[PDB]
Design an enzyme around this catalytic site. Structure first.
Site, PDB file in Angstrom:
ATOM      1  N   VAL A   1      -8.729  10.279   8.930  1.00 17.02           N
ATOM      2  CA  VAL A   1      -8.361  10.177   7.520  1.00 17.02           C
ATOM      3  C   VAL A   1      -7.947   8.728   7.284  1.00 17.02           C
ATOM      4  O   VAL A   1      -7.617   8.024   8.250  1.00 17.02           O
ATOM      5  CB  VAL A   1      -7.242  11.175   7.158  1.00 17.02           C
ATOM      6  CG1 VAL A   1      -7.788  12.605   7.170  1.00 17.02           C
ATOM      7  CG2 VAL A   1      -6.080  11.042   8.128  1.00 17.02           C
TER       8      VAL A   1
ATOM      9  N   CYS B   1       0.239   9.133   7.611  1.00 14.34           N
ATOM     10  CA  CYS B   1      -0.764   8.155   8.030  1.00 14.34           C
ATOM     11  C   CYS B   1      -0.651   6.890   7.178  1.00 14.34           C
ATOM     12  O   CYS B   1      -0.791   6.972   5.955  1.00 14.34           O
ATOM     13  CB  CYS B   1      -2.156   8.766   7.918  1.00 14.34           C
ATOM     14  SG  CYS B   1      -3.487   7.568   8.104  1.00 14.34           S
TER      15      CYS B   1
ATOM     16  N   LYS C   1      -5.576  18.760  13.630  1.00 19.96           N
ATOM     17  CA  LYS C   1      -6.630  18.222  12.772  1.00 19.96           C
ATOM     18  C   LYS C   1      -7.748  19.243  12.586  1.00 19.96           C
ATOM     19  O   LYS C   1      -8.372  19.649  13.577  1.00 19.96           O
ATOM     20  CB  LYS C   1      -7.172  16.934  13.393  1.00 19.96           C
ATOM     21  CG  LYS C   1      -7.915  16.018  12.439  1.00 19.96           C
ATOM     22  CD  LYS C   1      -8.235  14.678  13.109  1.00 19.96           C
ATOM     23  CE  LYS C   1      -9.164  14.873  14.306  1.00 19.96           C
ATOM     24  NZ  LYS C   1      -9.459  13.587  15.005  1.00 19.96           N
TER      25      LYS C   1
END
Lengths: 211, 202
Positions: free
Chosen positions: A50, A10, A37
């Protein structure tokens, strides 16, 4: 003892990892698999994203919120300028990054399927155009604010890392921006904050920065 | 000498006018009109929008950026918690209000024409839904963060002022929210910051 919930690839999470490593803090990174997730993510962050910072009874999300909190609590090195005038200028740059660059990062990361191919290409083109406009800055300036590394470099570094991964090609006049990118990527905290998966995003024709 | 380029009916500009009168320092308000927008505006803000703040060689736009800078230049009264944890929480609440409320204020202020009527209604419904969620906290809270007036109240007050102006009809549960809104509107700095054009909206 802060805990950071971090997506393995990410780019927003990478911002927060980079800050933690730059500051040499006591922290624990909890790796989150965004393909699978866990349900606690949406309990901690109603937007279900996140990175998330948890410290005692404090839960923060949004990478720039988290990083501003960490920078104030642990100001070594100071990533937001201490002078109020320069801090406001920097905050305005960060805000413009979010609007002109990272909404398109979000598109590339979040929209899926053949229906998203058109929006992805629009996102790639918008990023290319804006990054190319930034490039002349890095002829005179080591980092975004000059000699000193700052939150502006933190915020943009995960995108510059992913240009190949995203299929974004810049024209040759953007060369200073890529020299700047490599100046960030050579930083020892950047080398250490990369996840093993993020390291694989480095294009096959370029060597890795090492200690 | 701080200079604020201000839209006389612009809710984002009203945010900055409110903060400046709350601080009580020296400043000048320069009204900006569309068709009377000076060409200098694009140099200050390439998005071509008000509010814009100028101090010496500093040029800022975006109301929350402007107000955050004023809050730090002139500390008292503090419009954000001094405690770093509380302040981080409040910054996150402000950021969420931009996405949940003020993107829709921007739709109502900027989108024009019959093509926009559909999105204007979508913006009204979203604002109604979010304010309905928010209203019950003011059964117990004087202001958004409790006893202390803060940037959260600054940020939301121009919208609360404009609910009738925007044609937004709230659910039955909004009465505590409207009592809260009057608590902001009766502040002396809010009365000072109201333009003659804004006063007419209510």
């Amino acid at each position: 003892m802060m805990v950071l919930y971090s997506g393995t690839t990410c780019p927003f999470s990478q911002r927060c990892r980079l800050v933690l490593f730059e500051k040499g803090m006591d922290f624990e990174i909890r790796d989150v698999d965004l393909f699978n997730k866990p349900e606690d993510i949406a309990v901690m962050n109603p937007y279900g994203q996140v990175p998330i910072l948890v410290e005692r009874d404090l839960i923060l999300y949004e990478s720039n919120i988290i990083n501003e909190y960490i920078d104030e609590r642990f100001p070594h090195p100071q990533l937001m300028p201490a002078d109020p005038v320069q801090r406001a200028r920097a905050r305005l740059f960060l805000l413009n990054f979010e609007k002109e660059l990272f909404v398109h990062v979000s598109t590339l990361e979040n929209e899926k399927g053949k229906a998203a191919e058109k929006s992805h290409e629009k996102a790639r083109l918008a990023i290319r155009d804006r990054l190319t406009q930034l490039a002349p800055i890095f002829l005179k300036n080591k980092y975004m604010l000059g000699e000193e590394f700052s939150m502006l470099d933190v915020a943009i570094a995960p995108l510059l890392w992913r240009l190949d991964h995203y299929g974004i090609e810049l024209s040759k006049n953007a060369a200073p921006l890529m020299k700047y990118a490599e100046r960030i990527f050579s930083r020892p905290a950047y080398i250490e904050a990369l996840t093993p998966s993020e390291k694989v995003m480095r294009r096959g024709h370029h060597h890795h920065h090492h200690h």
